Symmetry: C5
Subunit: 90 residues, 5 copies
């Protein structure tokens, strides 16, 4: 759950070589800050808004919206769209 969102975000960040978001996301994971898939999205969303990381929010939208689709989870879908909104409003 936690790792399912986080690990995929990490993988997608490596593909675009966003090394700073990789560092920040992994820290949040290791700080014990993530206990659910839902928690992963809000934490990663918050981090990206604070540091102005448009590509992190793009990755986050894609990963969460597919996780929500795959699991039938309406809450994750909401956070994914809200991530893009943060991305727009940067």
């Amino acid at each position: 759950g936690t790792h399912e969102i986080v690990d995929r975000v990490l993988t997608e960040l490596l593909k675009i070589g966003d090394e700073e978001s990789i560092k920040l996301v992994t820290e949040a994971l290791e700080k014990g800050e993530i206990k659910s898939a839902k928690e992963a999205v809000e934490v990663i969303k918050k981090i990206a808004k604070e540091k102005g990381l448009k590509e992190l929010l793009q990755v986050l939208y894609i990963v969460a919206v597919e996780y929500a689709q795959e699991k039938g989870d309406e809450e994750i879908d909401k956070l994914a769209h809200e991530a893009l909104r943060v991305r727009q409003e940067l």
Copy 2:
């Protein structure tokens, strides 16, 4: 249903950085208008024909034929081919 079409369109728009189409599509989604995948294709195709958005229609054709293929939806398949006809007539 609705989000099945819209969310993949947004994901594909993100992959090519079509920031203009992303604005319009999430705007259409947020406006509570779209109640079905068929309405999703209709609204996006009409947006993109009005604005002359070749890349949106291409993404629309692909997302909608593959959705119509998966679920057996003759109406959506028709709408995808109409998306493509408008694009070629741009």
Copy 3:
């Protein structure tokens, strides 16, 4: 029923082959393609006459993956003919 032509147009789009999209969509409009086999035959014939190597490339890939998916030996045979027609242009 026309699974093959849909996958062909998606691939033609990526390479921006608007002429093949046109000619392929025309064949679809007229009711010509009602099965996988007729999909490959009609598209291969159209690519042979109009001299479209890129269409035959796309058709081979699409047809051969379709054949593998469904275990359809006649489509496989058709896919390789389209490749041969390409190699002789």
Copy 4:
């Protein structure tokens, strides 16, 4: 049998088209039409030797990828061995 034959050969041909390698395409399609390839294992073996003879590191790369993924799919340990062989041939060129 031809089931495994075309799974190897057709995916190799698909990948060669993607990189535009007409030289390999002609070499593989002619070996297939000449009856040189009657099983998955022979496909790998024939394409591997063709590529070694002509120094086609790009064809061995495709062959390795297609063969090891087929070997994992079918649990075929002989395809897997040939696949690693293809990679070694590529590496020694």
Copy 5:
């Protein structure tokens, strides 16, 4: 056994071909051929170690992706933990 070893090693090689990392391909094939690997988990540890000692950032990126997806497939928390270690080792290189 050899199944899990090759599921890890073979995909790493596949991904290394895609980025053209011939230095890593050689070091990985060398470790495979030397019977130094009995399981998927050992494959990850040995590849992670080589990549640390030779400073191979790209091998570690490939290793994380291969190992973390294998771990998800197999419900294998030990291999997941290795995958994140591989990313940390890359961060310090």
